[PDB]
Amino acid sequence: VPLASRAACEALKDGDMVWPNAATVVEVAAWRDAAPATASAAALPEHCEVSGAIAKRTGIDGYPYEIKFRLRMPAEWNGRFFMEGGSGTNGSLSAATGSIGGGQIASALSRNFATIATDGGHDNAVNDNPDALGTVAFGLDPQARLDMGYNSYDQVTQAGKAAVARFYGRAADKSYFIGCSEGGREGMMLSQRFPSHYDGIVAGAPGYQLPKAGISGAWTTQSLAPAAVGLDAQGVPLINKSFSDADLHLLSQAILGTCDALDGLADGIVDNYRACQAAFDPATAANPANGQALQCVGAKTADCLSPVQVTAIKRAMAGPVNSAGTPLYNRWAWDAGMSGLSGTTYNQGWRSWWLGSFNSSANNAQRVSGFSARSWLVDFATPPEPMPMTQVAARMMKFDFDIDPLKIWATSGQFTQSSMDWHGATSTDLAAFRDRGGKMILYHGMSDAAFSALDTADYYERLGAAMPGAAGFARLFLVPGMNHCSGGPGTDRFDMLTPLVAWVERGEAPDQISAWSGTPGYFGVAARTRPLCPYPQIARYKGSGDINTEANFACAAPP
Ligand SMILES: [Ca+2]
Ligand SMILES: [Zn+2]
Ligand SMILES: [Zn+2]
């Protein structure tokens, strides 16, 4: 009966603990000794670990579903509560020490937060249907779609805080959430749907319009097929064969030729992304290594993109339209992080989404036959479209941009909400959140090929338009060169939790956020640090000093 102790912990399993959801089943309530740090993780302090699940049930597809959660409460506690976000189609339960993304080694638990994670309402080892594209099969049960969209995050947040109050004898002082990609989508949902849940939110590469991802996939697949060479084993063009890595490298080298010095400093980084988009056209741009146009004047050479190739990538990058020309997603920024050479290793973190690996007799691009393609067909098209795995690439090739995009707005049968309803987080009404003191940091890599950074930018533009002074509670950090959540030739690592707490608890807004490069080899250097700047600002070299050193740069308007 002493608070914050072994006996208080073990007493949480079963009924002296009163859970807010009566269908909470604790499977584990265990005292854990402090654990040492490892090469990939910081030390963990002594704590009560609780895991279990909420709302065990049987879905209409005959499969079991439940909301799993795991929670960690340190014996020596700073008064703060933390939840980490998801990834992909979720379905797995992590260590739940409180990941802060950004390629960070530290966990929130290592900083004496109480921390929690969920699997989002389904389980990849159980919910795996061979007739419904394996692990996207949760899409066959309506309620599992709801838990994946919002309800699992909500159930798990309430369960955590109630255990925190019981264990420590007081409510948490402040609460925080960080997530990227599908995790970024959840933090944006929380600020909109559950504004008192978290005081501080970080949301990277946010899939805030995730049901549109597969529409862009069918589009980029069909856009690249004329440049393909040869067929796969089902008869479908080898989309991966449309550009060798050498070809994509010619592109990004041409983008650097047009765009790199527009920020004032030729450094392999397009800091002035707006000016870059205004200036770069592959059908006219020069290959800076030779005098000549990037696009072949006649026959194809190695220093030379064919007119078929140039036409294809321009169309992929423009974004999908229907027959009326209505934009269905957004366009994509040209940026050097479409390629990248570190040593002899070409950068795949852009390629892998629309093209897949050149060196293969099959298609393996995310948007052609991989997970995003399958996820669309079973999780976001309503009704679901299960099919054998070998028909997926053909189905993106036949995808009809007048018919099939409607299916992310439809309800049908017992699927009573559309995929945009339960998964979309497009709302700019953040007033409840700001007016209890909430603070939000958005980030996003410029050469992300899952979600367009420019579409996060348009979202932030709509937010500040609807809430004047938005920069007093919400700020957006674009990262030139970064791929999806990590990687690529840019400064893709950063501590997002320290500036967030300062903002929430002390009122210090972030005028910049320090960042560094996970792969400085992309520039041939041992390290690069750069200020991330609050949109619309960009990093600006002070005129003197090592270009790889943050302190020589300041956040400023574009020139
Ligand atoms: Ca530059
Ligand atoms: Zn455990
Ligand atoms: Zn040559």
3-state secondary structure 474-523: EEEEEECCCCCCCCCCCCCECCCHHHHHHHHHHCCCCCCEEEECCCHHHH
303 C-alpha to ligand 3 centroid (Å): 5
Taking the C-alpha atoms of residue 154 and residue 357, their distance in angstroms, rounded to an integer, is 39
Phi, psi of 223 (to 5 degrees): -70, -35
Taking the C-alpha atoms of residue 438 and residue 196, their distance in angstroms, rounded to an integer, is 8
The answer to whether 128 and 371 have CB atoms below 8 angstroms apart is no
Nearest to 160, CA basis, from 4, 31, 24: 24
Beta bridge partners of 26: 52
Phi, psi of 299 (to 5 degrees): -75, 150
Instruction: Give SS3 for 224.
Output: helix
Amino acid letter, 436: R
The ligand with the least distance to the CA atom of 541 is 1
Amino acid letter, 344: T
Taking the C-alpha atoms of residue 105 and residue 101, their distance in angstroms, rounded to an integer, is 9
Instruction: Give SS3 for 69.
Output: strand
Q: What DSSP designation does 544 have?
A: S
Taking the C-alpha atoms of residue 122 and residue 172, their distance in angstroms, rounded to an integer, is 29
46 C-alpha to ligand 1 centroid (Å): 46
Enumerate residues 6+ apart whose C-beta is below 8 A from 373.
Answer: 214, 217, 366, 367, 392, 393, 396
The ligand with the least distance to the CA atom of 304 is 3
How many folded domains does the chain comprise?
Answer: 1
CA end-to-end distance (rounded Å), the chain = 64
Please give all residues whose CB falls under 5 A of ion ligand 1, grouped by chain where several chains appear.
Answer: 260, 263, 265, 267, 269
Amino acid letter, 437: G
Residue 20 vs residues 115, 159, 176, 409: alpha-carbon distances, Å:
18, 6, 20, 33
Would you put residue 276 in left (φ > 0), alpha (ψ -120 to 50) or beta? alpha
**Burial classification of residue 361, based on how many CB atoms lie within 10 Å of its CB (0-12 exposed, 13-18 middle, 19 or more buried):** exposed
Taking the C-alpha atoms of residue 363 and residue 356, their distance in angstroms, rounded to an integer, is 7
Instruction: Give Cα 319 to chain centroid, integer Å.
Output: 19
Which one is catalytic: 197, 423, 444, 484? Answer: 484
Tokens of 68: 């799993």
293 C-alpha to ligand 3 centroid (Å): 13
Beta bridge partners of 342: 345
Measured on CA atoms in the order 34, 37, 43, 49, is the torsion positive or negative? negative
The answer to whether 41 and 20 have CB atoms below 8 angstroms apart is no
Is 197 marked active-site? no
Instruction: Give Cα 489 to chain centroid, integer Å.
Output: 18
- The CA-based angle 185-464-273, given to 5 degrees, is 75
Residue 358 vs residues 110, 219, 228, 247, 361: alpha-carbon distances, Å:
42, 19, 10, 11, 9
Taking the C-alpha atoms of residue 101 and residue 120, their distance in angstroms, rounded to an integer, is 18
446 C-alpha to ligand 1 centroid (Å): 14
Tokens of 9: 């912990």
344 C-alpha to ligand 3 centroid (Å): 17
287 C-alpha to ligand 3 centroid (Å): 11
Site of tokens 């109630």: 162
Taking the C-alpha atoms of residue 279 and residue 250, their distance in angstroms, rounded to an integer, is 17
The ligand with the least distance to the CA atom of 32 is 2
Is 122 marked active-site? no
User: Residue 63: which domain range?
Assistant: 1-559
Taking the C-alpha atoms of residue 433 and residue 17, their distance in angstroms, rounded to an integer, is 30
Tokens of 193: 């749907």
Question: Is residue 100 a known part of a binding site?
Answer: no
Amino acid letter, 257: G
Question: Is residue 269 a known part of a binding site?
Answer: yes
Instruction: Give SS3 for 70.
Output: strand
Sheet of 474-479, strand order? 24-32, 47-58, 64-74, 114-118, 80-84, 174-180, 200-204, 439-445, 474-479
The ligand with the least distance to the CA atom of 301 is 3
304 C-alpha to ligand 3 centroid (Å): 9
Question: Is residue 88 a known part of a binding site?
Answer: yes
The ligand with the least distance to the CA atom of 275 is 1
Tokens of 503: 């903002």
Q: What DSSP designation does 109 have?
A: G
For residue 318, give the H/E element and its range: helix 307-318
Strands 114-118 and 80-84: parallel
30 C-alpha to ligand 1 centroid (Å): 52
Site of tokens 């309430």: 158
Taking the C-alpha atoms of residue 21 and residue 173, their distance in angstroms, rounded to an integer, is 23
Question: Is residue 367 a known part of a binding site?
Answer: yes
Taking the C-alpha atoms of residue 459 and residue 453, their distance in angstroms, rounded to an integer, is 10
Nearest to 354, CA basis, from 230, 176, 223: 223
Q: Crossing angle, helix 182-193 and helix 152-168, to 10 degrees? A: 70
Measured on CA atoms in the order 372, 373, 379, 382, is the torsion positive or negative? positive
Q: Residues, the chain, total?
A: 559
Q: What DSSP designation does 23 have?
A: T
Nearest to 47, CA basis, from 26, 33, 35: 33
281 C-alpha to ligand 1 centroid (Å): 18
Taking the C-alpha atoms of residue 250 and residue 413, their distance in angstroms, rounded to an integer, is 50
Tokens of 481: 């060169």
Is 249 marked active-site? no
Site of tokens 């019981």: 166
306 C-alpha to ligand 3 centroid (Å): 15
Which one is catalytic: 448, 455, 492, 517? Answer: 448
Instruction: Give SS3 for 120.
Output: coil
Instruction: Give Cα 459 to chain centroid, integer Å.
Output: 15
The ligand with the least distance to the CA atom of 303 is 3
Which one is catalytic: 181, 252, 375, 447? Answer: 181
DSSP string, 177-194: EEEETHHHHHHHHHHHH-
A 10 A CB-CB count for 432 gives: 13
Question: Is residue 372 a known part of a binding site?
Answer: yes
301 C-alpha to ligand 3 centroid (Å): 7
Residue 199 vs residues 20, 102, 341, 433, 475: alpha-carbon distances, Å:
21, 20, 41, 8, 15
Taking the C-alpha atoms of residue 29 and residue 524, their distance in angstroms, rounded to an integer, is 49
Taking the C-alpha atoms of residue 149 and residue 210, their distance in angstroms, rounded to an integer, is 11
The answer to whether 114 and 80 have CB atoms below 8 angstroms apart is yes
Q: Crossing angle, helix 213-224 and helix 307-318, to 10 degrees? A: 170
Resolution (A): 2.0
Amino acid letter, 450: A
